[PDB]
Amino acid sequence: VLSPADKTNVKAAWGKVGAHAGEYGAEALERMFLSFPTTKTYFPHFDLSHGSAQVKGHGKKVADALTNAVAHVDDMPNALSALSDLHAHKLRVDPVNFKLLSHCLLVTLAAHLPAEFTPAVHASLDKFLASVSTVLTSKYR
Amino acid sequence: VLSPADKTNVKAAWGKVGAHAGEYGAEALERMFLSFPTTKTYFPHFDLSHGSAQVKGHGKKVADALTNAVAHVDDMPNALSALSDLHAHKLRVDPVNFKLLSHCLLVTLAAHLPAEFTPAVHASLDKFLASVSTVLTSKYR
Amino acid sequence: VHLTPEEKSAVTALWGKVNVDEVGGEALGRLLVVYPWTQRFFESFGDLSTPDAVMGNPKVKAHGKKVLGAFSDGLAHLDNLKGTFATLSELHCDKLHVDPENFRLLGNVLVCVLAHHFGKEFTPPVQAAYQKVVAGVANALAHKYH
Amino acid sequence: VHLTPEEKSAVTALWGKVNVDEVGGEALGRLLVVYPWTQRFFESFGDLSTPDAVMGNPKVKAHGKKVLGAFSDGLAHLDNLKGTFATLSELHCDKLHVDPENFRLLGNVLVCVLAHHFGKEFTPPVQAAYQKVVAGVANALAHKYH
Ligand code: HEM
Numbered sequence: 001v002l003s004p005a006d007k008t009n010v011k012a013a014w015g016k017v018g019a020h021a022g023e024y025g026a027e028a029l030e031r032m033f034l035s036f037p038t039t040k041t042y043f044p045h046f047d048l049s050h051g052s053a054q055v056k057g058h059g060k061k062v063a064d065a066l067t068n069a070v071a072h073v074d075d076m077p078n079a080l081s082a083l084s085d086l087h088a089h090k091l092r093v094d095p096v097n098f099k100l101l102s103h104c105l106l107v108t109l110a111a112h113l114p115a116e117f118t119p120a121v122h123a124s125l126d127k128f129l130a131s132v133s134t135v136l137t138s139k140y141r
Numbered sequence: 142v143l144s145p146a147d148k149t150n151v152k153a154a155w156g157k158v159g160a161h162a163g164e165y166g167a168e169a170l171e172r173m174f175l176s177f178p179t180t181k182t183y184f185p186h187f188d189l190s191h192g193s194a195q196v197k198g199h200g201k202k203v204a205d206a207l208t209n210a211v212a213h214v215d216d217m218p219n220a221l222s223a224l225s226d227l228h229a230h231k232l233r234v235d236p237v238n239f240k241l242l243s244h245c246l247l248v249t250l251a252a253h254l255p256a257e258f259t260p261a262v263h264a265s266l267d268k269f270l271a272s273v274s275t276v277l278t279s280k281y282r
Numbered sequence: 283v284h285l286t287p288e289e290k291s292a293v294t295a296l297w298g299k300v301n302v303d304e305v306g307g308e309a310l311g312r313l314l315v316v317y318p319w320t321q322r323f324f325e326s327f328g329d330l331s332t333p334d335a336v337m338g339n340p341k342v343k344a345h346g347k348k349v350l351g352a353f354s355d356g357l358a359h360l361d362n363l364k365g366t367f368a369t370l371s372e373l374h375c376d377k378l379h380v381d382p383e384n385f386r387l388l389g390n391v392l393v394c395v396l397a398h399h400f401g402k403e404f405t406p407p408v409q410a411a412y413q414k415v416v417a418g419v420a421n422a423l424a425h426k427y428h
Numbered sequence: 429v430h431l432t433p434e435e436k437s438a439v440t441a442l443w444g445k446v447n448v449d450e451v452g453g454e455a456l457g458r459l460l461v462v463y464p465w466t467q468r469f470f471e472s473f474g475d476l477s478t479p480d481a482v483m484g485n486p487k488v489k490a491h492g493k494k495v496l497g498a499f500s501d502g503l504a505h506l507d508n509l510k511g512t513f514a515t516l517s518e519l520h521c522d523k524l525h526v527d528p529e530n531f532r533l534l535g536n537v538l539v540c541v542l543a544h545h546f547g548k549e550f551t552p553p554v555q556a557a558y559q560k561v562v563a564g565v566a567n568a569l570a571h572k573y574h
Pocket residue numbers: 039042043058061062065066083086087091093097098101102132133136
């Protein structure tokens with residue numbers, strides 16, 4: 001569970017991301033595709049080249065869903081309900097891949113927020129990404 | 142999320158385990174130590190030889206906790222709170238190991254329940270074990 | 283993979299009692315029932331709505347025997363799994379887009395099927411030997427992914 | 429492990445700018461803060477209750493320096509990580525009883541620290557090369573487990 005301290009850390013870090021959220025979402029996807037090549041099997045229909053507008057467009061959707069989740073930290077299951085159905089019944093992404101994207105999102109935040117990414121904020125962000133991942137896979141079976 | 146059909150399947154399969162819960166618990170541990178040797182790192186203070194009193198005794202404690210979880214399947218977080226605190230604050234077993242013990246428990250039940258281990262019951266027991274593992278690691282951080 | 287001569291005989295001995303077509307259909311059907319997201323590659327197989335629909339589906343059965351037949355032939359090359367599955371690895375990555383995590387899930391479902399099928403003959407040491415094999419085959423199939 | 433010329437150049441060039449003493453303390457401290465259960469191997473280190481206590485702990489800093497120091501030696505032997513870490517692998521298994529999964533966690537925390545420290549210089553291609561290296565070191569260290 002996210003403590004009051006965790007929620008404050010997450011809203012503070014994401015607040016600093018601000019309008020750069022979409023750019024960071026695309027960077028996190030590029031990091032994941034390069035570091036963990038197996039994740040590319042879910043995007044055979046995408047041009048995965050660096051600078052690809054399809055990855056930049058998808059990065060923005062992922063980042064917007066995260067912004068929505070931060071705004072509804074106390075009510076994530078309902079805020080992310082359509083996304084849980086989508087991943088559980090259509091996309092069917094194996095659960096292990098959520099840990100790979102979460103790691104790459106963390107690396108992207110570390111690379112962009114040097115002053116904000118303290119050890120305490122790092123721990124809170126990691127807990128937040130595991131909760132989002134838990135919600136998105138709650139309807140798998 | 143365990144559905145009503147899952148709870149019905151788990152109760153039926155476990156009822157059949159019955160008085161063998163302790164010996165099936167001991168067998169699942171032995172299968173884990175042999176198949177996944179890294180799990181032995183958490184038991185350096187145990188005589189892990191086949192049939193040892195410590196493994197049979199520990200196997201019995203694991204099975205009782207599992208029978209308790211089956212008896213209170215609608216309220217697992219509360220039923221297993223003491224065990225949840227024990228694993229998060231004292232034992233500190235990495236979460237990956239719960240998947241390994243769950244697989245070995247599933248193999249033990251398959252080898253002992255020829256009539257009951259249908260595909261639907263197999264899915265229900267796997268979900269049940271994943272739920273128990275989730276409750277036991279819910280207080281890790 | 284490194285198997286002691288005793289682990290190899292344990293694997294081979296039990297395998298000679300396996301009805302490959304039967305166990306293949308059983309393993310793939312259970313994979314699709316227990317881990318439903320694996321159904322993503324099989325939309326053309328038709329009705330996969332319930333556990334009974336999956337187990338009785340003739341296309342699931344036919345694919346199960348194809349998958350287990352290649353696994354069976356691989357048992358004769360336990361000392362060279364990577365070279366034996368190189369082409370199948372490339373096919374699964376480049377054309378089929380199968381996340382290698384699926385191979386690990388199938389391997390664990392196969393171990394449960396063997397335990398259900400053999401009961402007490404599927405001893406803890408025999409399971410340990412089969413665990414190394416399914417991990418070895420999963421790694422061999424994932425080696426050409428890029 | 430097998431790295432392409434550019435990946436080996438990326439790993440080596442970045443490492444020449446790493447102050448092992450400071451980076452090691454950061455990586456170990458963050459491991460203990462972000463994944464608290466890893467504190468089970470360090471009961472004799474003192475105060476580890478708060479993030480500030482862990483990060484300022486002199487014993488956490490001294491140990492981090494030892495760990496990354498051994499890690500450094502491995503970068504000089506990327507072609508033979510298993511031979512390089514065989515003795516340390518046995519030590520961690522037989523005397524320390526450290527679950528190898530901890531090596532994976534430390535490797536990922538190290539990648540986060542490098543990104544935090546280097547910013548835009550830790551590009552996606554550089555991270556990919558480091559992920560291969562940390563997975564290789566983790567595997568080399570788990571190799572002698574039995
Ligand atoms: C932080 C976790 C994640 C979030 C918030 C997220 C969110 C989303 C969103 C917002 C969409 C777009 C739905 C729409 O069009 O309305 C989507 C699509 C998709 N996601 Fe996820 N996702 C996550 C993790 C994953 C992972 C781990 C993978 C696989 C490696 C993945 C693969 C996909 C695929 C293939 C699509 C379809 C893209 C397309 O065809 O346009 N997702 N996701």
